[PDB]
């Protein structure tokens, strides 16, 4: 399971990442690295929050909410970019599970709908 | 596509991929077990011929799925022909071929 | 045990299959299913020899050699089924994390 | 596609690297980075020849041969070492094919068996 999940995320057609409890990268899809400007180096075990330290507590709440077993999906969401241009998003945050029924972390997905 | 098909087949949970006719495009091994299917080729076989007893309630969910809607239930309860009760977690999701290809379905017995 | 390998073979463009120490399917490529006329049922965990009880002793030694750690590659081979087939094939071990052989992976391809 | 290989290489337990036609890295395994001392940073597109310029014609001809589609594998190769230790290596160099498919480059594996 765990590895297959990890491999499935790496291999995913869209932008996917998998994280542990500390929001540290367990795995990344290729689109995710591109979409998030992450490079091709090894980022595994790195922390999303160190990498982006300007996130805003709004995401932190969501990440927290997911880490407690909530599946969060928003079909069309809207942000206004620092750009000044509005961007539209589809995203999902959901927990993944350890062998025991303890939450391992989260898997997150996003796509530009805009 | 095939990427999708291949993931569902080797999923660690009970997964199946359907077309707009609700006929199988792919299936996980656990789906095969939980659903009482064989190790046989089931491709192109309609889910509804296989489970004719299956209700209008579900059919409605599937069409909603077919309409591009993702449908989720974390804890659900339903009663079966045996009339033993089963608690369930289920997700029904569209997949796109970009118009909608079909649906992907997941169920887990609690 | 190698999920990564199972994944690689499943998605392979060529004819590839992965076996355990007892020669039962761990993973199959599409071309292999087609080329070998497996069909589309669930064949994983099935033994290759049972599906094909006719397979010769010549292959069994090769599969056996492979399970003993040998990488076997033949660039061009000829065989007869009445018609003739020209072939390239590879048999080699895949390994468990403990350093033990876990099985073999087999690849076949037409050279003409 | 390219991805299947890249992912395969990247998650290899052994030391594995994937190169393009000009011998610049497309993917690297962790052991390869460790064994070859490249570090955890993105090296994608760097040329192996630039990173190691002392590399011989002995390798180059071999690399080239693989790019010509040859599968080359050596079960035991011995190199004497500055250390005074003979080192034996197991290695394979072989082509990978683009979807067309023409060689997209080579895949190289080295393992110390001494």
From TrEMBL, chain B:
Domain PAC positions: 72-110
Full protein name: histidine kinase
Organism: Geobacter sulfurreducens (strain ATCC 51573 / DSM 12127 / PCA)
Taxonomic lineage of the native organism: Bacteria, Pseudomonadati, Thermodesulfobacteriota, Desulfuromonadia, Geobacterales
Whole sequence portion shown: 88 to 199 of 844
